[PDB]
Structure formats: C-alpha cells, structure tokens
A paper describes a structure:
RV is a non-enveloped double-stranded RNA (dsRNA) virus with three concentric capsid layers encapsidating eleven dsRNA segments. The outermost layer contains the glycoprotein VP7 and the protease-sensitive spike protein VP4, which define the classification of RVs into G and P genotypes, respectively. RVs use the VP8* domain of the spike protein VP4 to recognize specific host glycans in a genotype-dependent manner. Our studies show that VP8* of these genotypes engages the type I precursor glycan (Galβ1,3-GlcNAc) at a unique and conserved binding site that is present in all P, P and P HRVs, and the subtle sequence and structural changes lead to an altered glycan configuration at the reducing end in the neonate-specific P RV, that may play a key role in the age-restricted tropism of some P strains.
Author numbering: 62 to 223
Write the structure that this text describes.
C-alpha cells in the first residue's frame, strides 16, 4: 500500500528544494559530503556500534582528515561534521543514533534540515545558509526521495525503520 521513490544509486548532484533525501547507510565511514563552497560544509560519518575510542581517517571534500571517534552504544551513530567557512575547522554539530541506519537531508526555507537525536525520537534541526541553491552533495550509498509534504513518512522511516 506504499510507494517510495527510489532507490537512487550513489551520485553527486544538487538536490532540489522541498524534497527529503532519505539516505541509506551500509557501512562505517563517510555517508555523504555536502557543500556550497561558501558557508556550508557537512559530512556525515558513520561509526558502528561498540567502538571504543579510536583514531580513524576519513576523506572529506578531497582532504584526508583524522578524527578520534567513539560509539559506546548498541546503535549506529551518524556524526554530522560541519564547517561554516572554507578555512574553518570541522566540528561535530549534531548526531543521529539509530539502528535504522537512515539519515535525512532537506533543503527548505533557506536552510538545511536533518534528523538528529536518538531513534525512535529523532527530531529535525536546521543550519542556515545564504546559498542554498549551490549546495551539492556526494552520496556514497543508495537513497530515496520524499517530498516535504510527505515528511511524516520520512520521519517514520528515520525513526522506526525502512
């Protein structure tokens, strides 16, 4: 009784406004890398359950980066790593803890919205940008597309599973 647009194969593109990208995650590492090359960089890093503090390397926007990471929980963690200018540092802005292993990204009202917190009570949160139009995302896994008018379904998928 339900129809979902997708899956789409891993790709690089500029997502339209008003659509959720529901991005699957199939492994530890970089889930996606999104930037407009002016005031918005977000890369999501997946860390598998039960990882004690450890150093790992990730390729973010063409550069090798080292992060000390930890996941004490029995759920996957998806760390949003953000920087707000080209020469700013990355910081962990927000995190989704979820064994549903799905993350969401919406361009809407001059902002980027994502889900954070711990499922099944994950909620949406925003980052402001002056250049939404040029945000381009590299997605390293299969994803689906859900119109914002169907956000309630994206919420259910993120929180309760696909």
């Amino acid at each position: 009784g339900s129809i979902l647009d997708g899956p789409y194969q891993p790709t690089t593109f500029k997502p339209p406004n008003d659509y959720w990208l529901l991005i699957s995650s199939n492994t530890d590492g970089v889930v996606y890398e999104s930037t407009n090359n002016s005031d918005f960089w977000t890369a999501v890093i997946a860390v598998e359950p039960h990882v004690s503090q450890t150093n790992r390397q990730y390729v973010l926007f063409g550069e090798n980066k080292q992060f000390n990471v930890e996941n004490s929980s029995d759920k996957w963690k998806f760390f949003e790593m953000f920087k707000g200018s080209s020469q700013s540092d990355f910081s962990n802005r927000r995190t989704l803890t979820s064994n549903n292993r799905l993350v969401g990204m919406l361009k809407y009202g001059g902002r980027v919205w994502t889900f954070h917190g711990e499922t099944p009570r994950a909620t949406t949160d925003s980052s402001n940008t002056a250049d939404l139009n040029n945000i381009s995302i590299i997605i390293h896994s299969e994803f689906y597309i859900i119109p914002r008018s169907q956000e309630s379904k994206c919420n259910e998928y993120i929180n309760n599973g696909l």
